[PDB]
Design a protein around this ligand. Structure first.
Ligand code: TTP
Ligand code: TTP
Ligand code: TTP
Ligand code: TTP
Ligand code: MG
Ligand code: MG
Ligand code: ZN
Ligand code: ZN
Ligand code: ZN
Ligand code: ZN
Lengths: 192, 207, 207, 190
């Protein structure tokens, strides 16, 4: 057997809740699982992706374990993909949870590759703080102002800094354009 | 706008957890909701609960129409956008009309309940709800016997499977019930309403 | 193994295209399938046709049990793993037991059909099928009026909305039928089975 | 409004058929659409030409929906194009392979998953065991094409089949984690 399930979406979408839901199902059938977290739900804390494999090799590991949970994958590096693929190759079901976007609206750490490797994708939505539509993005605010493109990706926090928004209501001051004709197109279309 | 979302599946699937998850989302955007529950026993219950941690307030109601009465009453918050209805299986067919009407009048209605009774047949009014729901989420549990995705609730009294003709309604948890796949759902004395069905099962046991 | 997949939605949603798509997949792995169709729908004769891609042959059958008879007959290829059934809404309740039995005996059964009749009510036996289906795909069309996701089929005779009491079965296409959202589905003389429904609709029209 | 829908999966999964089905729906409501395709529908040499075409006189102003088929052959510039399209009121429906023969992200598609509002990952049927197939497998003379072979190679059943995870095998697959091969050994022990 063996496969990867990916639970994702912006902040305030209930990712962790959904992970917990899926894990709680296993208990009624007495199926053992183990959850990892990068350095509340109960979980082994870990410094880097490879340490997961070492822990499973260690004496701490219960041999009956069928399922491996990984929460907040966005804080790992690319090494997590190979770890998750290998675990799935060797009969483990791996359920993974994390943000798909950083505050810029860009792929958060290694998650982009994870979508490719996941057998099952669940992209959850939050509710837009501005208009109430389905929210796909996390927005960061610093004293009421939309955070700048060049600010730090990693910044731990809650509603003090962050809200969930739709596409339309996600704005990043000073976002660059990689395609020469992009700004031209936006101009062209503001003409109506 | 206005629509119906249906969360369903067997027992031990996390239906209530999923309902709570969707309603919790609304709070971070300050969007108001109201949850209803059919009155099952004598206990007054005022929260639905997910073992995920969260609990949300619920109004108890003795029939589907009372939901509309409550929304017309003074207790109703005008800002309410979303109506949650848990354990719909215990309502009668009147719940469909209620839910449709709510959706027609701009409410988002999120509905949770069992699709099957212990016989593996449509539980109360839920069959029609599938039709009316804009969005269907059929969750699974884990089969107690083989670990496959479970689609069925199985009832056992003193270790023996429930007979087909037992009472549909019987409140309880793992002392009576488990979740199972199709293959591991067996109901002693299951009828066949097709004259050729038994014949076909015979024919196929031959190989 | 064995399971039921249900493809559903209003008219103009691409249900038959999606059924065909799933069966086409099986051919690249050389997995055999067999497709059934009720007789009343005279739009395609002994084949299943999307207004696209291609079409593929199907056996015509008047009632559900005939499906099992055919599988027991000499005409049946023993290699067949998958049974497709299109336009289920025209069968009666016996189709559910047939589909359950097929899944119990190792067949994958892929089923397509309308969830609503023109009244916006459960079409024939489909309501129970939602319960028995392991997997549900409710597809949408595009609303003829507003371009929203369409969930309903609207029937019109000479531009006039069909009355609630008209005949359920009426074969045809865009001459009679369109796809609409909830808000744009209107049926003259729709009854209310709940004593407080019309009261609620009045109360809410007040704002 | 504006959003991205992404249809993906291995070869033989019906991706194009599903794209076509979604496009057909629009015709019954008279909603106009336009489809693009890369130079291996309007044919195009690179992602930005899409935007240029929409700016040109060839473009019908009533167009609400933009279809993009086999995105895997575009470069990363396609993401920015698709995002920009969605920000300016277009519904963009995108179809392509998620994996190259290696079982690794095909061209730009990995970013697309992140940007798509809606993801539909289709499966094919494993040519080997009949399970859900998630991978495209390449064989020449019945041999599993080596990890180091060319990514781009046009063709059909002559070279390619659809397989589940277990039946996807790449000779000489590297391991970027120092403890990987160790772990695979450890578990071979049972
Ligand atoms: C968007 C963003 C979030 N973060 C941080 C802030 C939070 O501490 C953390 C988000 O944790 P999450 O669990 O993803 O946030 P959440 O609890 O609202 O989501 P859920 O309920 O669905 O589980 O990541 C960054 O560091 N940088 C960023 O750009
Ligand atoms: C299957 C079945 C259940 N019941 C009762 C037993 C329980 O009291 C109730 C089931 O409640 P549920 O909330 O569906 O059970 P659950 O908490 O395990 O489900 P979930 O986690 O997915 O939310 O219905 C019957 O009365 N008759 C039946 O045939
Ligand atoms: C709504 C309705 C339809 N019909 C008939 C009209 C058509 O013959 C048939 C609908 O068949 P469908 O195949 O469901 O219509 P369609 O071809 O547009 O479906 P799709 O594109 O999604 O594959 O049902 C009734 O007899 N009574 C009704 O109330
Ligand atoms: C896996 C793989 C495919 N290809 C090529 C071979 C094919 O010509 C093309 C894939 O065919 P497609 O037409 O993109 O997909 P498909 O038609 O087989 O399946 P569907 O019906 O779902 O649309 O891409 C590569 O060039 N490199 C690769 O690594
Ligand atoms: Mg519950
Ligand atoms: Mg059809
Ligand atoms: Zn918004
Ligand atoms: Zn089982
Ligand atoms: Zn409409
Ligand atoms: Zn396989």
């Amino acid at each position: 057997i063996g496969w990867i399930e990916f639970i994702t979406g912006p902040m305030f979408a209930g990712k962790t809740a959904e992970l917990i839901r899926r894990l709680h199902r296993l208990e009624y059938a007495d199926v053992k699982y183990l959850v990892f977290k990068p350095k509340s739900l109960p979980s082994v804390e870990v410094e880097s992706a490879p340490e997961i494999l070492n822990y499973i090799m260690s004496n701490s590991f219960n041999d009956e374990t069928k399922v491996i949970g990984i929460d907040e994958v966005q804080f790992f590096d690319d090494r997590i993909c190979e770890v998750a693929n290998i675990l799935a190759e060797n009969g483990f079901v791996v359920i993974i949870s994390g943000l798909d976007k950083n505050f810029k609206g860009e792929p958060f750490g290694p998650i982009a590759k994870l979508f490719t490797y996941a057998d099952k994708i669940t992209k959850l939505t939050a509710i837009c703080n501005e208009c109430g539509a389905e929210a796909t993005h996390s927005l960061r605010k610093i004293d009421g102002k939309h955070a700048d493109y060049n600010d730090d990706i990693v910044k731990i926090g809650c509603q003090e800094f962050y809200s969930a928004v739709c596409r339309h209501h996600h704005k990043v001051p000073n976002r660059p354009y990689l395609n020469s004709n992009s700004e031209e197109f936006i101009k062209f279309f503001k003409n109506k």
